[PDB]
Write a protein that binds this DNA or RNA. Structure first.
Lengths: 105, 98, 95, 4, 79, 97, 84
DNA sequence: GGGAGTAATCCCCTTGGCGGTTAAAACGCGGGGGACAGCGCGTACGTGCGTTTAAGCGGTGCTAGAGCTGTCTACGACCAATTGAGCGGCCTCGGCACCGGGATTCTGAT
DNA sequence: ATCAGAATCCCGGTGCCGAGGCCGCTCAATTGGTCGTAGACAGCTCTAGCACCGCTTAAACGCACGTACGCGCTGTCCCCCGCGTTTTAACCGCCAAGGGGATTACTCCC
């Protein structure tokens, strides 16, 4: 029935279409535009959540928390490049000590 | 008495504060600072607490990132100790200071 | 009370595909809702310019596809374009 | 690889 | 001045998270100055959005739209 | 006769090429480089003459700006000679990958 | 109707020196030259990939100055006078 | 013909004060090791110039294709009626937060 | 090498308040339709991009030379760290109250 079920998507094609219209991004929005964009947003959502789920498992947690989103983003090459100008609340930083600082003896 | 050698505990502090995600500046001192600065732009502004929390997250994330670049600038000078010239170089190469 | 829409249910639906036993905190959910809103605005804002530069009134799936290839890096663009093309293919094949 |  | 509420040990903790092993005593006055300049620029923008809405309360969204205009997007505060 | 010591004309060159706005890369070698790179992205592309000049103006501006940041990194190390680690630092602090 | 290779070596050593001299560089270690070639090639790859994407979307075969201007604008390295 | 100026209302939320505690900050002190100034040398950078390369100029040819105009109709915008998806709210309980205990693994001095 | 001390880690017990499910309702997705114009596309044309020749000489190259500056080592001085003690005020639970965000109606202007 609904366009998301036609596209095979979880993300809301109809709402993406509404936002494309009301954002004034163009005088008109083609019928394939929200289907394609919803599929891209769903993919990127799945890509982060896949990695964050693994980061959660590595911390024995069952619930993803911002720590795991920061770990998922910053450990992944393309996602770190996509989110290079993004700061994540409560994310922290990657564990990283410059090798010259370690107590070589 | 037992005593750790210089820098041994600094490394433990690095490990600790890179594990944790807690905000490292105390909230009330930062909030009073935000209000002090805001009072220069408009008299008797009010802030949502989530607005002050947003400003703190941005401020700590910015300073933490700047210290990482400062650390590299110090190490590049073969130093272990970061110094104002390291902050100024980082700020300059970032283009924050023209 | 005034009603505020968000992507929360859809991120959760996707989460239960990738990691059925995993949950997500409301702070992490707020971040994921922010992420989707940001990436939406980037692609739509680029596709708008791609339409304008071509003097064309419509944002089509073709404007989205180029905007994705411009914005997303590396393999992430290649997979995203694959998912987008498959979705539009299936959608236009619907009755 | 990557998902989906 | 309230800028001195950004105490030395707090700046050190930020430096420790930044991976800094050893901190010159001059770094503290530098870091206060840098932070004060950073906050002034972000608050000026946030106040502008607040005054454009003719509000008196600065909201979190005014800050997020400031930070995004500053090129420094923040995820997690509803933006 | 006369014979300069090393680094004496370098200052003259620093003055000359800052005052001179002219493009410093040979135009035809750069054009072949552009086409070589473009041939990976699409076969049998064509380039407007002004498009190649636009790329060269940007590329020389980019490299000059990076060499300024590189020179600061060298000076920060208390070196006169710039070295690859100075480029890598400058690029890293810019956040380039 | 040709294939091109090794043209990065056409960015001559004295040309790189001239750019560095304009950048105020007083003295240049010889390892800078291969380093600068790599950096330039990465820069050109990013800009040309975008310009080709704009060209393909316009369904053109000729890369125009406008495609380069937009590709540079995407980096924040906007180049003026060539148009908008 | 509907955006928005605006006036009246609620009551969320924000500012503000206070009292206890005690976690964190401020201070002093000892000395380890780091910063950095000297000096030595050798290797690798710059300047010179004779030789070589091919960039540049100009000319000329051509044809790919950028760009422009005409015609059609597939497409998307507007609309009214219908429906259930998505929201706010309410509730339940187990994942996570915390304490406390023992294990063990690092640190550094002897 | 070995040992004692500190610290971090792993483990089990307690418990609470946030995440997940359920409800119900309302407004926004969508279905079916008409309309009309965006743009697909086909045809033309004449710009300018590619190719080639060939002459000139600007620039690149390579080999010599030497000297200047990279950096390796060393010594000294004082600045930072670690940490024991004293002091501050951050925190937070409570409570007060009223500003103004937000929502409504009324209406007149663009």
């Amino acid at each position: 029935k609904t366009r998301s079920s036609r596209a095979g998507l979880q993300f809301p094609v109809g709402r993406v279409h509404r936002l494309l219209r009301k954002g004034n991004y163009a005088e008109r929005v083609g019928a394939g535009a929200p289907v394609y964009l919803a599929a891209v947003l769903e993919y990127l959502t799945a890509e982060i959540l896949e990695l964050a789920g693994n980061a959660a498992r590595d911390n024995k947690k069952t619930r993803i928390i911002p720590r795991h989103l920061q770990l998922a983003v910053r450990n992944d090459e393309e996602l770190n490049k996509l989110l290079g100008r993004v700061t994540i609340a409560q994310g922290g930083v990657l564990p990283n000590i410059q090798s010259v600082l370690l107590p070589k003896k | 008495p037992h005593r750790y050698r210089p820098g041994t505990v600094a490394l433990r502090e690095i490990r600790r504060y890179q594990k944790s995600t807690e905000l490292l500046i105390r909230k009330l001192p930062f909030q009073r600072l935000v209000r002090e600065i805001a009072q220069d732009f408009k008299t008797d502004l009010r802030f949502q607490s989530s607005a002050v929390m947003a400003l703190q997250e941005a401020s700590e994330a910015y300073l933490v990132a700047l210290f990482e670049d400062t650390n590299l600038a110090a190490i590049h000078a073969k130093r272990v100790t970061i110094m104002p010239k390291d902050i100024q170089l980082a700020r300059r190469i970032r283009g924050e200071r023209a | 009370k005034t009603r505020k829409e968000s992507y929360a249910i859809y991120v959760y639906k996707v989460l239960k595909q990738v990691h059925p036993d995993t949950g997500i905190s409301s702070k992490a959910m707020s971040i994921m809702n922010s992420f989707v809103n940001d990436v939406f605005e980037r692609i739509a804002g680029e596709a708008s310019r791609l339409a304008h530069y071509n003097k064309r009134s419509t944002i089509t799936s073709r404007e989205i596809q180029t905007a994705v290839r411009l914005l997303l890096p590396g393999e992430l663009a290649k997979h995203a374009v694959s998912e987008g093309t498959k979705a539009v293919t299936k959608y236009t094949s619907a009755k | 690889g990557r998902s989906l | 001045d309230n800028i001195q509420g950004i105490t030395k040990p707090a700046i050190r903790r930020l430096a420790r998270r930044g991976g800094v092993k050893r901190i010159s005593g001059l770094i503290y006055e530098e870091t206060r100055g840098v932070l004060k300049v950073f906050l002034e620029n972000v608050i000026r923008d946030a106040v502008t959005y607040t005054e454009h809405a003719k509000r008196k309360t600065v909201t979190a969204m005014d800050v997020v739209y400031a930070l995004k205009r500053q090129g420094r997007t923040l995820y997690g505060f509803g933006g």
